[PDB]
Assembly symmetry: D3
Homo-oligomer: 188 residues x 6
């Protein structure tokens, strides 16, 4: 259906390199649609930056302890599809945070808690797939000053436990999207 790989023992960093096509397959032998969830540092390299806006105003994307979500879908490489899914997934996370008594807020693809930004994300396409990245702060250390952040520990949430519950939630989200797309007749 969809491959879920949660790297639970070691750690892996994110330099924006994992956004490329076939990243999950080339590095994990995971074939087709897949969600790879890991935890590590965050120092996106300029040459791997997808947001053309972050570049024009050379913004810096940093973090030390962040939870990473790498999604690759071999669907029609439509930028509108990538954008829609990304915000649907962020919205699922925002709702999930409420199970922990946390009042999250969504501003497009960004998640906010008590006015502070908890996440980062990007959605785009390759010539053969949809790639999406979601990042949730665990600790606010290493994050570039300007806007202020917040993380999972300060919110009283165990990361490894959140990775299990949230990865499951996102997979369910995507599978429901696929199933619903197959039970409806086209209309004139």
């Amino acid at each position: 259906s969809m491959e879920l790989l949660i790297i639970k023992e070691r750690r892996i960093d994110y330099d924006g390199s994992a956004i490329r096509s076939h990243w999950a397959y080339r590095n994990f032998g995971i074939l087709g649609d897949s969600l790879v969830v890991f935890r590590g540092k965050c120092n996106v390299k300029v040459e791997e930056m997808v947001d053309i806006e972050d570049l024009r105003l050379r913004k810096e994307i940093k973090g030390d302890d962040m939870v990473h979500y790498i999604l690759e879908l071999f669907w029609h490489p439509d930028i509108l599809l990538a954008s829609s899914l990304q915000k649907l997934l962020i919205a699922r996370l925002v709702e999930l945070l409420w199970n922990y008594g946390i009042e999250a807020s969504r501003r497009g693809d960004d998640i906010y808690v008590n006015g502070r930004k908890l996440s980062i994300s990007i959605a785009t396409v390759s010539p053969v797939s949809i790639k999406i990245h979601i990042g949730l702060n665990v600790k606010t250390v290493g994050v570039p000053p300007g806007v202020d952040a917040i993380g999972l520990e300060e919110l009283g949430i165990d990361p490894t436990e959140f990775m299990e519950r949230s990865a499951k939630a996102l997979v369910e989200e995507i599978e429901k999207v696929r199933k619903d797309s197959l039970k409806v007749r086209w209309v004139t």
Copy 2:
């Protein structure tokens, strides 16, 4: 941008045909991507039912008073995009219900409040567009026995005022989905 039309004074019943392509243009001359919001009865004619499951199970889809959202997007007619978009929109309505002091939750594409179903929705495509319907009960009368439904009236929400506030939230969501798809470069 996107066209928005909220019908506040007249009532319009939904028998399922509003789901057809070019409905907004044929009926009101609204050209291109549009969202039409109105209120009226709901009794979907078997010949107009989109969910094939619902036909298989001979199910009824009726309500005496419901707020309706008919969306047409002239994007690539992909069923997966239609499906994604549909749930992101429902998710936005749920987040909007929190601003009203309501603990609503989402179960795929259905809206729930205290174990009772508040909505109905369907998403599909025509040969030239994406079409989405979202129905929200105002009253509980006329709604088919099976699930326990709840309406906006019992939740103490003025339909007219909600239609305005939710319509603006849904249009804002779609336009952001669009702008975001335009600010990212493709990846290898």
Copy 3:
């Protein structure tokens, strides 16, 4: 992956209407990609004829005992993809027949043995999916005047056993098509 349903307990006739979108989901509740193999009569109503040339030559498509394969794939509805896939499937059946000691040959999408035609097939699309039909003559009773047919019975092949073995071959063919499509990088 894909669902396979071989109707073994009873006969089902083909009037061409099984070529329509969501046929398998509507009649058997099978969601998504699917192959439904069954046995019955064949009498295509001019109403349901897909080959435009046949409608021109006012030809008849009938047979009293035929093995039917109805394939539906919810992939991009591309007529070229439907046509390529159809002929690959026909080619697989021709190779399979040699495993039974039969010398079959292919002429595009038609199978021949002893210069006689054994099959009929059609590949088209709906607004939401690819649809393919393959019919193999079990007996040559009820077949039209014009050209010689030959059926499995005459070839000494058991329909039941062949339905089982060919259905698995086709499903495996389609699965490999899908797997290979996911292990290759795009090129410049």
Copy 4:
């Protein structure tokens, strides 16, 4: 109609670069859908390998005398289409081999004889086209040990003459795929 260029006498080596877009037009001015068939060495450069599986087990793809087929189709750049069309072509070559009295069988995209692999192949897409490469061993020298190989010479087949007959059969295959795709009406 499609373009065919057979390079019999001059030898062209294959290092994997011929798989890129516009290769045929760019080098020989052959515009549009085309099949170029030549002979030469094979030594695929790891930076030019399309199959990611091989990059994983970092295999080697080489031989000293191989018949090469480079196909480019400016159809919708769909990986599923590239994959299916590929396998239909490999299948047509197998059917051709039977005409030479060869007991050839297919295993996905590979041709075997006596349990030995006679070929290599790959199918992928560029942002503007479909590209397929089929390689047949003429001789087994230079080939890397692991899986046992076999060549056209050992089969007692004249390379040049096979090149002429095989190229023709492949072009005919693609042309029927196209014509069949234009004679069918779409279905509901």
Copy 5:
């Protein structure tokens, strides 16, 4: 890349009631497979159930004429409405350029051809689940045309229907083939 099909019906007249806009029309009726352009002459009386322009339906317009040159184009390309619309206006533009070689000061307003403020044509572009379908119609006479908009025909311009049909058909086929050839000789860009 290679070619396309053309058929000019010179032996008789065929009336356009809008149903020729349907997919596989040329193949169903004339056996012409694939991309094609069919040119004929006859009356124009579009049935409301065959009308494609939704705006014509809303305004309840009559699409009539007693003598018109019809062009029915079908292209089995990606059934994209934007492609259909672009291509349709490129062809009307070519027809405009062509009238100049006949000494006519004609102009273009979208997909409509005008001469001295008077409308000479009608046209529509759309898609079917499997193809692009385009219709172009040029008044031969302005008889039978519903009153309102000032119409002009080929006769009043001193152009021979038959000869124009032949030259314009060739002009449109060449236009399409250059559109195809140009798409094939360009590399994609990052």
Copy 6:
């Protein structure tokens, strides 16, 4: 709608890199469909020539003073759409020149005035958009010997005023293309 940016203040040279995707957005902050018209020199680097026939003929694309039109549309990346649109725009310019009392003619995508070439143009796609460039000669100085060339100056057309009028006509043409595509029903 569509963003139009006419650069009147300074000049900008075209080396061919402006044809890249998101050029207008990275350089001017213009998001979405856009037309950027500017004036400058034409010196196209071989590593950025798009017309492969130009590479094969080793042609030079030089000019000292030229009016440049760089169009980017985030529509389906269909090379046939790119091609079609490009020649429709060139046809508009040719029509526009008539209102200047000039006897212009069109040869595919090239504009002619008395057997002399006034323009250069290319149409292609990126993995996410359609990119077109139109170039009109202001002065025939710097253009390589070969085809008798011609410019705006010699036609007595003020570049600045023409840039203003031509730009509005192109934008206008693109909108009608869009609008017309939205008011038509699909056909069976």
